[PDB]
Motif scaffolding. Sequence first.
Motif, PDB file in Angstrom:
ATOM      1  N   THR A  22      36.531  26.127 -23.819  1.00 10.54           N
ATOM      2  CA  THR A  22      37.928  26.280 -24.210  1.00 10.54           C
ATOM      3  C   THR A  22      38.706  25.053 -23.744  1.00 10.54           C
ATOM      4  OG1 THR A  22      37.796  28.688 -24.072  1.00 10.54           O
ATOM      5  CG2 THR A  22      39.975  27.676 -24.040  1.00 10.54           C
TER       6      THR A  22
ATOM      7  N   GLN B  23      49.402  23.756 -16.989  1.00 11.39           N
ATOM      8  CA  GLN B  23      48.720  22.733 -16.198  1.00 11.39           C
ATOM      9  C   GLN B  23      48.466  21.375 -16.906  1.00 11.39           C
ATOM     10  OE1 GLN B  23      45.185  24.899 -15.062  1.00 11.39           O
ATOM     11  NE2 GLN B  23      46.123  25.658 -13.163  1.00 11.39           N
TER      12      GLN B  23
ATOM     13  N   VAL C  24      42.019  36.564 -22.643  1.00 10.50           N
ATOM     14  CA  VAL C  24      43.001  35.478 -22.600  1.00 10.50           C
ATOM     15  C   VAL C  24      43.586  35.257 -23.982  1.00 10.50           C
ATOM     16  CG1 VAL C  24      43.075  32.928 -22.572  1.00 10.50           C
ATOM     17  CG2 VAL C  24      42.396  34.150 -20.541  1.00 10.50           C
ATOM     18  N   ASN C  25      42.727  35.234 -25.001  1.00 11.83           N
ATOM     19  CA  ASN C  25      43.226  35.095 -26.361  1.00 11.83           C
ATOM     20  C   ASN C  25      44.218  36.199 -26.706  1.00 11.83           C
ATOM     21  OD1 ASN C  25      43.161  33.702 -28.903  1.00 11.83           O
ATOM     22  ND2 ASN C  25      42.211  35.574 -29.696  1.00 11.83           N
TER      23      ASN C  25
ATOM     24  N   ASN D  55      37.818  25.138 -19.447  1.00 11.41           N
ATOM     25  CA  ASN D  55      37.460  26.224 -18.548  1.00 11.41           C
ATOM     26  C   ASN D  55      36.275  25.879 -17.661  1.00 11.41           C
ATOM     27  OD1 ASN D  55      35.917  26.600 -21.179  1.00 11.41           O
ATOM     28  ND2 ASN D  55      34.896  28.117 -19.873  1.00 11.41           N
TER      29      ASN D  55
ATOM     30  N   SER E 142      52.876  35.839 -19.141  1.00  6.03           N
ATOM     31  CA  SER E 142      52.436  34.449 -19.185  1.00  6.03           C
ATOM     32  C   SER E 142      51.872  33.986 -17.850  1.00  6.03           C
ATOM     33  CB  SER E 142      53.586  33.537 -19.617  1.00  6.03           C
ATOM     34  OG  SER E 142      54.732  33.746 -18.813  1.00  6.03           O
TER      35      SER E 142
ATOM     36  N   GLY F 232      48.944  29.361 -18.447  1.00  5.67           N
ATOM     37  CA  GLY F 232      47.893  28.841 -17.561  1.00  5.67           C
ATOM     38  C   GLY F 232      47.214  27.556 -17.890  1.00  5.67           C
TER      39      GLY F 232
ATOM     40  N   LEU G 278      48.317  34.081 -17.846  1.00  4.24           N
ATOM     41  CA  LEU G 278      47.665  33.023 -18.594  1.00  4.24           C
ATOM     42  C   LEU G 278      47.511  31.746 -17.791  1.00  4.24           C
ATOM     43  CD1 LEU G 278      49.120  33.541 -22.151  1.00  4.24           C
ATOM     44  CD2 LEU G 278      46.800  33.981 -21.301  1.00  4.24           C
ATOM     45  N   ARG G 279      48.060  31.688 -16.580  1.00  5.02           N
ATOM     46  CA  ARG G 279      47.984  30.484 -15.768  1.00  5.02           C
ATOM     47  C   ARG G 279      46.573  30.296 -15.231  1.00  5.02           C
ATOM     48  NH1 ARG G 279      53.465  31.141 -12.352  1.00  5.02           N
ATOM     49  NH2 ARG G 279      51.955  32.426 -11.196  1.00  5.02           N
ATOM     50  N   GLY G 280      46.132  29.051 -15.219  1.00  7.39           N
ATOM     51  CA  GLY G 280      44.717  28.777 -15.070  1.00  7.39           C
ATOM     52  C   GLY G 280      44.050  28.617 -16.419  1.00  7.39           C
ATOM     53  N   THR G 281      42.976  27.841 -16.438  1.00  9.13           N
ATOM     54  CA  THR G 281      42.341  27.489 -17.701  1.00  9.13           C
ATOM     55  C   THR G 281      41.074  28.322 -17.843  1.00  9.13           C
ATOM     56  OG1 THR G 281      41.180  25.638 -16.714  1.00  9.13           O
ATOM     57  CG2 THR G 281      43.373  25.248 -17.530  1.00  9.13           C
ATOM     58  N   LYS G 282      41.269  29.568 -18.241  1.00 11.91           N
ATOM     59  CA  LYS G 282      40.147  30.469 -18.414  1.00 11.91           C
ATOM     60  C   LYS G 282      39.632  30.403 -19.844  1.00 11.91           C
ATOM     61  CE  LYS G 282      42.438  33.477 -15.092  1.00 11.91           C
ATOM     62  NZ  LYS G 282      41.292  33.992 -14.308  1.00 11.91           N
ATOM     63  N   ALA G 283      38.374  30.795 -20.003  1.00 16.30           N
ATOM     64  CA  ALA G 283      37.786  30.941 -21.322  1.00 16.30           C
ATOM     65  C   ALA G 283      38.604  31.922 -22.168  1.00 16.30           C
ATOM     66  CB  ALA G 283      36.343  31.419 -21.183  1.00 16.30           C
ATOM     67  N   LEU G 284      38.690  31.633 -23.473  1.00 16.21           N
ATOM     68  CA  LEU G 284      39.510  32.437 -24.378  1.00 16.21           C
ATOM     69  C   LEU G 284      39.068  33.899 -24.434  1.00 16.21           C
ATOM     70  CD1 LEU G 284      40.776  30.579 -27.540  1.00 16.21           C
ATOM     71  CD2 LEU G 284      41.750  30.898 -25.278  1.00 16.21           C
ATOM     72  N   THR G 285      37.761  34.164 -24.342  1.00 16.00           N
ATOM     73  CA  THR G 285      37.208  35.510 -24.467  1.00 16.00           C
ATOM     74  C   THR G 285      37.078  36.240 -23.132  1.00 16.00           C
ATOM     75  OG1 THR G 285      34.899  34.771 -24.311  1.00 16.00           O
ATOM     76  CG2 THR G 285      35.927  34.761 -26.488  1.00 16.00           C
TER      77      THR G 285
ATOM     78  N   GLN H  15      47.440  35.526 -25.074  1.00 22.26           N
ATOM     79  CA  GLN H  15      48.075  34.387 -25.727  1.00 22.26           C
ATOM     80  C   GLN H  15      48.752  34.809 -27.028  1.00 22.26           C
ATOM     81  OE1 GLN H  15      45.245  31.132 -25.982  1.00 22.26           O
ATOM     82  NE2 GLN H  15      45.252  30.784 -23.771  1.00 22.26           N
ATOM     83  N   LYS H  16      48.045  35.552 -27.892  1.00 25.38           N
ATOM     84  CA  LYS H  16      48.680  36.015 -29.126  1.00 25.38           C
ATOM     85  C   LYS H  16      49.866  36.921 -28.814  1.00 25.38           C
ATOM     86  CE  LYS H  16      45.147  37.910 -31.356  1.00 25.38           C
ATOM     87  NZ  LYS H  16      44.349  38.395 -32.520  1.00 25.38           N
TER      88      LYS H  16
ATOM     89  N   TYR I 136      42.142  23.303 -23.542  1.00 24.07           N
ATOM     90  CA  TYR I 136      43.598  23.346 -23.589  1.00 24.07           C
ATOM     91  C   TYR I 136      44.133  21.921 -23.684  1.00 24.07           C
ATOM     92  CZ  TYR I 136      43.149  28.139 -21.822  1.00 24.07           C
ATOM     93  OH  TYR I 136      42.771  29.436 -21.600  1.00 24.07           O
TER      94      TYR I 136
END
Lengths: 556, 412
Positions: free
Chosen positions: A441, A549, B238-239, A462, B264, A545, B267-274, B242-243, A443
Amino acid sequence: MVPISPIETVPVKLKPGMDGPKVKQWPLTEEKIKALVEICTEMEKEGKISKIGPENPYNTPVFAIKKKDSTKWRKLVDFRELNKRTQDFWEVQLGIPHPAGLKKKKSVTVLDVGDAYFSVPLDEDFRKYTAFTIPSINNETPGIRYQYNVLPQGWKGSPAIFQSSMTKILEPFAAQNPDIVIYQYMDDLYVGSDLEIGQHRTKIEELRQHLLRWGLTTPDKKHQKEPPFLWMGYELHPDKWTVQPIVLPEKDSWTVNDIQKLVGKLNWASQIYPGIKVRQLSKLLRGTKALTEVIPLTEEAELELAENREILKEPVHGVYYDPSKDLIAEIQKQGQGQWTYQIYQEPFKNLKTGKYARMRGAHTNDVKQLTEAVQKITTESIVIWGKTPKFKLPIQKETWETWWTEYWQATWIPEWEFVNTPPLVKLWYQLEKEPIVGAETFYVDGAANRETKLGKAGYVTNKGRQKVVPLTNTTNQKTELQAIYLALQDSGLEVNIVTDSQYALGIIQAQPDKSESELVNQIIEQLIKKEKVYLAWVPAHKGIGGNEQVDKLVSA
Amino acid sequence: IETVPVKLKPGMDGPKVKQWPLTEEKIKALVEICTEMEKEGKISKIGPENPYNTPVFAIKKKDSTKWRKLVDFRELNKRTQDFWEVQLGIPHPAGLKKKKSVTVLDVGDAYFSVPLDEDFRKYTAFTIPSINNETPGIRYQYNVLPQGWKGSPAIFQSSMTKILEPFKKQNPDIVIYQYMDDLYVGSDLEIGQHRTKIEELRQHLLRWGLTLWMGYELHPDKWTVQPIVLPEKDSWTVNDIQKLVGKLNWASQIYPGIKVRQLSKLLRGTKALTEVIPLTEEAELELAENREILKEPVHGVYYDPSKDLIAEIQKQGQGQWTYQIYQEPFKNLKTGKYARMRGAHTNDVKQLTEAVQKITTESIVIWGKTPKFKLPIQKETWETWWTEYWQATWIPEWEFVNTPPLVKLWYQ
Ligand SMILES: Cc1cc(-c2ccc(C(F)(F)F)cn2)[nH]c1C(=O)N[C@@H](CN)c1ncc(CO)s1
């Protein structure tokens, strides 16, 4: 004397709130005055004009030009000022009949009526504004005053009143002669039939009888022509038709005139000669606006005019329309947004051909262009033949099905089948509908400074993968695109990409396969290579998130 | 039996619209239809001293297989005087929108018994086109009141009030509204019994033709305006969030109070969408408050008959179409969605055309006006094909949307 039926008069008025014309009669040389006194005398004794008194205050100038290679002076009135004041007439002269639309009749006779427009009466309440003055010798008597009693040549309403009257007269003859066809276009009347040439010229005679009943004189001795004819830049033969043979001009420093006389002339050839392309020649035009300017041929131009030439070498002919056979239209992609097409009913023999150039757009794809060309051919066919042709298209049925079913816009092409003549129009990429599990993923984000035009684009993923690139001479919109380009360039075959750029979304959701922007085409080139791409949008400056960032990282 | 004086409004010439090409069968159908109309005196041939033109074409109406003539009078209607001399036109019945059933009756044929102002006839000119510009066009003009002209109901309204004064005499329950060539008849009555007093009106119409056979049964109370719905899930990716945050952000333009600060933050942090994330308790509360906010209607959304009604339509796939009618952005006066089953299981343009017709009908019922459409289709595609599925006697205005709106997600 057999009595003449009167031709019904068309009431005419000048435009609302306009007076008549009052322009002064030019000073003419003594010989020219002598000529027009001669002409008007016979035309007066023919009932076509009549002297008017000093009451008529209107005046239109009249001149006399001399017939070339012949000692017959003839007359000219310049009706421009009265044309400006006359009412508008109706415009049925919207098109010119296309030869591919004529049905093959075995006998066809064309009769010119360059005479009859003068035997049709003019509305008498309007004759007062047709007044003109023949200036007298030495200007020592009042110029003899004249007015028209019939449709004057060069007048605005003459062609419409003449054709309206002619159609009125032709109705019962055509109705009671269903075994013929009569078309009427400008000064000519086209008459065709499928009976033996004997009963043809009999019914031809009969029609001339019928127009004598209204006092309209017809060509007789020879005069009326039978195929073939040179007509409106075409060559109309009994079995066939084609462009008049017209050969390309030649220069070494080509000016604007040089190909304003050659694209418009290769446009003409493209209606029967298959595969004629014009683009590398027209880029040379829209980018300038000087009727005299020269500029050299581009490196791709003389490769195209060399391809053009290879087509205008042998005569290719077109067939006439058979309403009992199916109409077929076939399209070929030719590249750089150029499309070529042939309309026919049996193989190897076209009714007509043509081409379609893409619309000036910022982005585009092949399917949209093929769709637009189908619509153009559809409207052309309804114009010419009154029906929609069956299409043969270089796009697979499943390609079209996935396209129209997933395209955000509504679209449709009429009945059509796939023809396997490459280059086939393809779908080059397809975004996923749901996120890809197991795909990284990315961003992405980008930002630029409105003043320094410096900016940054990058991504955070990610798996901890990151990149931020510094950029010069860019905008917020360019960096948003660049960020996506980076994610694509640096990810595996499957990738989820998160952005806040509504601008980028708008471009990609439109699904272009080629772009004006160098940067979009790179992205397109990257999308084609991928296996699965899911593009997700989030609103900016919500600090989400990932798109919180990386927003920070691109504006630092 | 005498003419009523009709003008255009000063500074405006009559319509001069070009006739578009027609298929051979449509021209044939129009020739037959107009030859009879000429025989019945309804129209007469015209010379070239008439510079005006209005396009014409031919259709097949719903559940009937013989051609009908339609004249696009859109330009002439713009330039026609507004008829408020004796009466200020027909005031729209706000009760017609409120009835449990309403049915539409074609009354347009009744216009063909009343003459039109001999001075005005020159503005109704139309042209039956020829194939391949072979012979000139057949030009006609109207002597009687024409179907599709906005003046025809205005003039006939005085003489139509008497035709129904016996009917609304016996049935003060029933709201009757007329728009163009249509009579809209509505009642709070039972379904079987609403069909009964209708056909009565059908014959009460035949009694006065001495001195129009089928029905369309709308139900303006069988449906209503559509709220914004949020998903109800037990586990959110996460998706998903986001939607959700995106639609909430979009709805916060319409509703004042939509908070996405609690959601929101998830949603902070860059996690995988699924990747699933449990909902924070304050995030769960925030979504609960947003739900309650989305259940009330928008505050201060008013209809203004002085402004245009706009209709947007989004293609959603599998034969479903969404739409919204509004005058100011984000203040929808109605929203809805189109279903399927009505032809074109493979023709997008027939669906959109039928969708445009249904939205205009509902718009006629609610406000007595038609909206200006924003169509998700290229001009060249729409223009080429919309007349081959059009069945209504009126025609709205439309423009074309060339950029894919992000809002398609939110109305799905
Ligand atoms: C011998 C002939 C048959 C015809 C025709 C054929 C088909 C049709 C129709 F109705 F089928 F479309 C109508 N006319 N025209 C001509 C013809 O020579 N016209 C001469 C003057 N008479 C000129 N045309 C352009 C000129 C200077 O730009 S001079």
